Every structure is written in C-alpha cells, then in structure tokens.
Amino acid sequence: RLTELREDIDAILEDPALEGAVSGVVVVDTATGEELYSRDGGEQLLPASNMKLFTAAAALEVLGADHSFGTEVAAESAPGRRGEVQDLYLVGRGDPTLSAEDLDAMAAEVAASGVRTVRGDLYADDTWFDSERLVDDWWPEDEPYAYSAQISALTVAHGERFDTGVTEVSVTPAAEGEPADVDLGAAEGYAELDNRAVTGAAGSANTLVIDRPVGTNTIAVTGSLPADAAPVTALRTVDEPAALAGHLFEEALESNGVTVKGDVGLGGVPADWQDAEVLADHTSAELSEILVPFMKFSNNGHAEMLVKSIGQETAGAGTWDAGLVGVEEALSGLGVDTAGLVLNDGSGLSRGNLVTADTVVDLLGQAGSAPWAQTWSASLPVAGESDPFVGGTLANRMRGTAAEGVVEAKTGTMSGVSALSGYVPGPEGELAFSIVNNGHSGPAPLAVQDAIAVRLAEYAGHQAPE
Ligand SMILES: [Mg+2]
Ligand SMILES: [Mg+2]
Numbered sequence: 001r002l003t004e005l006r007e008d009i010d011a012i013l014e015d016p017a018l019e020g021a022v023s024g025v026v027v028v029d030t031a032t033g034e035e036l037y038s039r040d041g042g043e044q045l046l047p048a049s050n051m052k053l054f055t056a057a058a059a060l061e062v063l064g065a066d067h068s069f070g071t072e073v074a075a076e077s078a079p080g081r082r083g084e085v086q087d088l089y090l091v092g093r094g095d096p097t098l099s100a101e102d103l104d105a106m107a108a109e110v111a112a113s114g115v116r117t118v119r120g121d122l123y124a125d126d127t128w129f130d131s132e133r134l135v136d137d138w139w140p141e142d143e144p145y146a147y148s149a150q151i152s153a154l155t156v157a158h159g160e161r162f163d164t165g166v167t168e169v170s171v172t173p174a175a176e177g178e179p180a181d182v183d184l185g186a187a188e189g190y191a192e193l194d195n196r197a198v199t200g201a202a203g204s205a206n207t208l209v210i211d212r213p214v215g216t217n218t219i220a221v222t223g224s225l226p227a228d229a230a231p232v233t234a235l236r237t238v239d240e241p242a243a244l245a246g247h248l249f250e251e252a253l254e255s256n257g258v259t260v261k262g263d264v265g266l267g268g269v270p271a272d273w274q275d276a277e278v279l280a281d282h283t284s285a286e287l288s289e290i291l292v293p294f295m296k297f298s299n300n301g302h303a304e305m306l307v308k309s310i311g312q313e314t315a316g317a318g319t320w321d322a323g324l325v326g327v328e329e330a331l332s333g334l335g336v337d338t339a340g341l342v343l344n345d346g347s348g349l350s351r352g353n354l355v356t357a358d359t360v361v362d363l364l365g366q367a368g369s370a371p372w373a374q375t376w377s378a379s380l381p382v383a384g385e386s387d388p389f390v391g392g393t394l395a396n397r398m399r400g401t402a403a404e405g406v407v408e409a410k411t412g413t414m415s416g417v418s419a420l421s422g423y424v425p426g427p428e429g430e431l432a433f434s435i436v437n438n439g440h441s442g443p444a445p446l447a448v449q450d451a452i453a454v455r456l457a458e459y460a461g462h463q464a465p466e
Contacts, residue, residue, distance in 0.1 A: 002036065005459050009037050012451045021416075021439035024357025027456060030368050031429030036459075041358040044340055045438045048412030049298045049393075050355065050419040051348030053363055054341070056295055056379060058330035059306040060372040062313050065288040069095035069309070071102070071154070073110055073249075073280035075118075076273050083116035085279075087262070089269045090249045091125040092154025092242060094318065095284040096294070096305045097162040100186060100248055102282045107252030109280035118253065121262030124246030125269055128153035129308040129318030133240075135345045137352045144212040146235040147349065151304040153318055155241035156186065156248055160389075161293050164301035165241035167191065169210050171232040173199040173225045180208070180225045187238050190247040192218035200224035210234045242266055288375035295379035295410065296392030303346035320345065334366045348412060360421045360434035368423070368430065380408035380422055383453065398450050402457035402464050409453065412436075413444050420449040426460035 013023060024045055027037040047053075059067075070093045075085035088110075092098065133150035134143070142148040149155070149165030157164045167187035171180050180197040184190075197208055207223035210232075217239035225232060238244050246264045253260050269276055284290065294302040304320075310330070311323030324343040331338050340359050344352030367376050384404035385391030393411040398404055409422025417438055424431035433456055435449050 001459070005455065006037055008455050009452055012448055012455065013039065015445065015448050017443055017445045017448060018437065018440055020441060021437050021445070024434060024436040025452065026357040026361045027431060027433045028361050028365060029429045030365050030423075030432050036431070042340065042356050044342070044354040044356055045436045046351055046353055046417045047348050047355040047360070047419050047436060048414050048417040049348045050360060050410055050412040050421050050434070050436065051346065051353050052295060052298060052303050053360065053410050053421060054327055054331055054343070055303045055306055055346035056291060056376060057334065057363060057367050058327040059287060059310060060291070060370070060376055061330040061334055062310045062326055063287055065286065065372045065375045067287040069093055069284040071095050071098055071106070071282045072278050073106055074269055074276040074278055075115070076276065078277045078279070079114040079116070083114045084119050085115055085117070087120035087123060088118045089123045089125045089267070090154065090246060091128070091269060092152065092245065093128045094153045094305050094309045094312065095282070096155070096164055096299070096302045097157050097284050097290055098155065098245070098282070099157055100252070103156065103245070103249050103252045104255065106280035106282055107249065107256040107258065110253060111256040111258050113279045115258055115279060118258060118260045118262065122246055122250050122253070122260055122264045123267035124154055124242040124249070124265070125267065126152040126154035126242035127268035128312065129305070132320065135304075135320065135350050137344065137350050140214045143214060144236055146237065147300040149237045149301045150239065150241050151301060151308065152241040153305075153308070154245045155301070155305075156245045158186070158235065161297050161299070162302070163235055163299065164305070165244075166235045166237050167244070169219055169221070169234050169236050171197065171208055171210065171221060171225055173227050173229050175199060176201050176227045180221065182219070182221050184219055186248055187219070187244055190217070190244050191238050192216065194218050194220040197221040198224045200226045202226055202228040208232055210236055212236055212238070240266065288372070291375060291379035292389060296381055296389055298393055298411065300347035300349050303348070307346035331363065334370065336363050336366050349414075355436065357434040357436050360436070361432050364421065364423065364432035364434070368432065377408060377423065380410060383407040383409065397446065398454060400464055400466070401450070401454045402462040403450070403454045404465050406457055406462050407453050416440060418444040418446065418449065420453060424453070424456040424460050428460045431456055431460055
C-alpha cells in the first residue's frame with residue numbers, strides 16, 4: 001500500500017504543468033514519524049502564503065491563543081463642567097479586526113464620558129508599531145490591492161473578513177455617456193477621487209479600472225462601465241491606514257454628538273502627558289478567533305500586524321526585524337529546525353521568503369502536539385467546504401473528492417509560486433504534507449496539489465462524499 005502511494009505521487013509529479021518547476025513534496029505520518037513520501041524536501045523554495053503557517057504558529061506561541069488587542073482614546077485630562085477636552089488621541093495597539101462599528105462604539109464612550117467638544121485636534125496614534133508601511137521587496141504595483149495594504153498598529157478592518165487598511169470602492173453606472181458614479185466608501189473625505197470613468201452603452205464592454213497610483217492617496221477610476229452593468233465593488237488600499245481610522249473616528253465622534261473643532265492627523269500621545277485620561281477603549285476578540293479569517297482567507301495585513309505584535313511582545317519593538325526574529329525563535333523553541341527558513345515577512349507576499357517542504361512538515365508535526373493545536377488546526381481551510389469561513393481558499397477545491405471535509409491545509413499562490421500544506425486526518429493516523437512549487441510557467445499546479453491531497457485522503461481511508 002505504501003509503494004502504491006509513492007508510485008501514484010511520482011505519477012502526479014509528472015504533470016506537464018510542472019514543466020521546469022521545482023517541487024518540494026513531503027508526507028509524514030504524524031503518529032509514527034514515518035516518512036511516507038519525500039522528494040526535494042530540503043530544497044529551498046518560496047512558500048507564498050504558506051509562510052502564514054510559521055507566522056500563525058509563532059503568534060500562538062508568543063502571544064497565546066487568549067491574546068487580544070486593544071484600542072483606546074485618550075485626552076490629556078478628563079472633560080470638565082463644559083465637557084471640553086483639547087487634543088484627542090485614538091491609539092491603536094495592533095488590532096487587525098478593528099471595525100468602523102468599534103469606532104462608533106468608542107465614539108459613544110467618549111460622548112458618554114462627558115466629552116461634548118474636542119476643542120483641539122484629533123490624532124491617530126499608531127506608534128505601537130513602527131511606520132514602515134511596506135516590506136522592502138514587496139512590489140509597488142501591488143500596493144492598490146487589499147492583500148498589499150499598508151501595515152499599521154491603527155487600521156480599520158473592513159467586513160467580516162477584516163481586510164485592513166482598505167476602503168470599498170463602488171462604481172455604479174449612470175446614463176450612457178455620463179460619468180460612472182464612484183463611491184469611495186470609508187475613504188470618502190479621506191482619499192482623493194480621480195474619476196475619469198464613463199458609462200458605456202448598455203451591452204458594451206466593461207473596461208473599468210480602479211487604481212491608486214503609486215505614492216498618492218488618490219483613487220483613480222478609468223474606463224467604461226456598461227449602462228446595464230451591476231455595480232462594481234473593489235477593495236482598494238489607502239495611504240496611512242491610521243489617518244483613515246482618524247478620519248472615520250472624527251465622523252464617529254460628530255455622529256455621537258462630539259464636535260471636533262481642530263484637524264485630524266497622525267501623532268503619538270505626547271511624552272509630556274503625565275496621566276492620560278482614557279475616555280474610550282475597545283478590546284478585540286482573542287487571537288484564536290482572529291486566526292480564522294486570517295488563515296481561512298489568507299489575510300496578509302493580519303500576518304504582518306501579527307509579526308509586529310510578536311516584535312512588541314518579545315522586544316517592545318513593533319517591527320519586522322524584531323518580529324521576524326521572534327517568529328524564528330518561537331519556531332525553534334517549538335522544536336522546529338529553522339535552518340532552511342529565510343524570513344522576510346509574515347504573509348509570504350515577499351519573494352525574499354524561503355522554506356523547505358521538510359521545514360513545513362516539521363512545523364506541522366510540531367504544531368500538532370502543541371497546547372494550541374486545535375485553534376491552529378481550526379484556522380486552516382478545509383477542502384471543498386462551501387461556507388467561506390470553513391473552506392476559505394479551499395472552498396472550491398477538491399469538492400466531491402475523498403479530500404472534501406477532511407484535508408485541512410494552507411494554500412499559497414503568486415506568479416510562479418504555489419503551495420499546499422496541511423493535515424490529512426486519518427482513521428489511520430493524522431498525515432502532514434507540504435507541496436511547494438516554484439518555477440512553473442503556466443497555470444499554477446492546483447490540480448497536482450489537489451491530486452496529491454486527494455490521494456493522501458484516499459490512502460488515509462477516505463472516500464468522496466456523494
Ligand atoms: Mg468620510
Ligand atoms: Mg469525508
């Protein structure tokens with residue numbers, strides 16, 4: 001039965017989609033330690049989003065499953081008779097799930113604590129992390145897109161997926177030949193609008209492009225939207241997530257009867273504030289719950305914020321340098337051999353990252369026997385599951401195969417990089433596998449990945465749901 005599987009995987013790795021690609025494929029029985037399959041296991045390869053596996057493990061190790069994140073509002077002193085304060089600080093400590101709703105709830109707390117007037121300015125404080133918004137080797141053309149959002153300790157998360165540092169742009173067609181209507185969402189009044197888009201004739205081609213040109217906080221909309229087209233919605237990043245948070249909080253204050261007379265900007269709580277008055281605060285859900293939308297949907301901002309939070313925890317430095325060393329140390333401390341790990345970020349977006357398939361499976365084995373194994377396991381996309389919060393990036397892969405409902409694995413993709421690594425829960429024993437592909441010139445080898453993962457599921461005794 002073992003030689004059957006090995007022959008089968010060997011035949012899967014023959015697929016012409018892996019023409020000129022390197023592939024790290026390792027399968028280990030986690031109960032025995034038996035190496036079921038190993039090809040190019042020690043080879044160093046970009047992991048893409050599989051880097052999140054290391055980040056998630058480390059974050060659970062360093063911060064704990066029960067770790068939560070805080071945001072607060074501070075004035076130099078409490079409001080008096082007149083209910084007045086001077087300057088006001090919204091302070092973010094790295095909550096990657098901070099919503100506009102949470103901002104409104106804090107705005108109400110500010111109101112209810114007796115503030116009627118912010119006579120000075122409103123400042124957005126994200127100094128808990130450094131102001132290095134983007135990893136060096138990340139590509140500037142990626143910057144407009146949600147997965148490349150700027151990293152800040154104070155950032156507003158959009159939606160139930162908590163996509164950080166973005167706004168939702170809605171483009172609605174008007175009459176043919178009239179400008180399309182562009183609604184900027186949260187960044188209305190914050191980001192700049194450059195709407196050059198038109199409504200094309202009904203039945204015409206949709207050529208709508210929504211950009212944020214590099215180094216601006218302008219949403220540039222170009223192209224044409226057909227008169228009869230459904231509205232278009234896209235997540236677009238903004239410059240300075242904290243300042244958008246500031247802007248949104250300003251509106252939340254005005255909405256809860258708090259008049260803000262000054263300006264909204266970045267600034268940190270001054271050193272010379274002896275006893276800052278916390279007028280509002282908010283506590284995130286615990287990391288174990290945050291791990292779900294992070295890992296299911298592969299949230300890049302979450303990963304990076306978690307690296308900086310690790311940096312803060314191990315070193316009081318909300319920093320990639322410190323956080324990445326913190327990941328490496330936490331992984332070593334877990335028994336993981338990190339010899340082949342090059343860490344350049346937490347998300348796996350950076351092309352400076354390296355792993356080996358051996359390292360991943362090493363990690364999977366180590367994570368499996370950890371006190372947080374289950375929260376870690378629960379965060380992983382489950383093959384073929386319809387519920388996006390269950391199936392995540394594997395929602396529409398391996399449906400109607402033995403893998404459906406059983407294989408828990410993290411996906412990874414970008415140009416010339418693809419990865420699938422996780423567990424195949426066995427009525428035999430729990431298998432761990434890592435499939436990392438670099439180089440392939442055409443379609444990502446998702447069917448190869450699925451083929452292996454399906455074969456492993458069958459091998460572990462599973463059968464396709466019908
Ligand atoms: Mg606004
Ligand atoms: Mg099943």
